[PDB]
Amino acid sequence: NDYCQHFVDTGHRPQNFIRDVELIRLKDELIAKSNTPPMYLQADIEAFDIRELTPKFDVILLEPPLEEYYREKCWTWDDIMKLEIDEIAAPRSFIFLWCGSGEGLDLGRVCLRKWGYRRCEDICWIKTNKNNPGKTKTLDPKAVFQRTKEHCLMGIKGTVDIDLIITEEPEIGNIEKPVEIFHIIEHFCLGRRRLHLFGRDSTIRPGWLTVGPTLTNSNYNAETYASYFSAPNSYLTGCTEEIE
Amino acid sequence: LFPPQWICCDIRYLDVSILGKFAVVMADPPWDIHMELPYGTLTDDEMRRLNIPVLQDDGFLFLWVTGRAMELGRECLNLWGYERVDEIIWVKTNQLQRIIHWLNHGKEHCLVGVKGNPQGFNQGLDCDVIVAEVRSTSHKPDEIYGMIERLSPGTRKIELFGRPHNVQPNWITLGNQLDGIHLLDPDVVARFKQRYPDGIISK
């Protein structure tokens, strides 16, 4: 069957028909034991000196609020590219950059290179419309096709899961990204200093430092935070037992 | 001339100016992805130097990319004069619709480039996700031809680095494993005779 034709016929996206969309439970349980307390800081990242965020991070998840997320303060790729991300990333570290579905797939690669990473994975969040087949999409002027996915670029600097997330398209104006991206990241066992830039009250999570303008509360303290990673815990992956 | 046409050639040396202008170009090039492959590859410089620019004035380019070609393909696309305006992914399933370095790969990527000011195309009919079964390894999914036909019905199209299974009405297919030269469009046939009077492409 040709599901592209079917989408033309009915309005059901082809991804609506993908099916199925203690093994790796020690992992997860080891992750949960390893996790630092959740930590969070309200900060206007535009006006904020990013270098106050210490220590250097093993993983950075970067989720800038793109204009395209508001179909019905936006950050342009001009703003994002000017962030000093390389100033806070560890010499060996990883970045996960939500890039949207338009020009961000190009400018986000420029950003990754600008900050010193190379792309090693491209994770696509594929959005089903099983609940509103009869909801046509209002296209970007340059679009050739209806855009039904977002890309999260994985980048590496220095020396179980699939690259797809499938969920239903959120309601209009819901900008949340699927929480599954956190599972993929934590399953990589990349180290324990994890930073989420442009997170929200609703994304705060154990094992993560969340920084963003709309946080209603803070508990960040750089000395307290650094203390979770002082010896003997400096090089844990986040997937092993705590050191007695 | 509507029915399938093809040319067995080395795309590095064919004079593509004899083919005229196309509404859609598609390529699944043999990129040097810095792994060992069962087919011959083109170097980065050979890819850059391909004479894609003479093939269109106003239309769309469909460019399959994997690995480091996700980046190199974007470079070639811009060098040849295109802006990347979309990106199609093909979710690979089995016959029961289940999905087949750091992550296992469930998809393949096709960049969509635009050149000039295309007019009369049907933009927005299809969406940018293909769900289809791996009918054979190394093969792109046939659905891409349907989406391109609905996007630009009846127009002239050219595929580079195609194989015999790829020949399609409205398409001229170029590849070095094709069976000879089969050209039916009278403009192309004339230009071919003039440029290649002995039916041989060399330098």
Ligand SMILES: CNc1cc(N2CCC3(CC2)CN(c2cc(F)c(CN4CCC(C)(C)CC4)cc2F)CC(=O)N3)ncn1
């Ligand atoms: C020297 N100059 C030439 C060369 C030439 N070709 C003829 C055709 C060519 C390469 C050489 C096709 N090739 C091949 C096989 C592949 F898997 C891929 C990768 N791609 C990735 C995306 C996908 C949808 C998964 C589908 C796969 C790309 C490929 F190009 C195998 C082959 O044997 N030949 N034609 C004229 N001139």
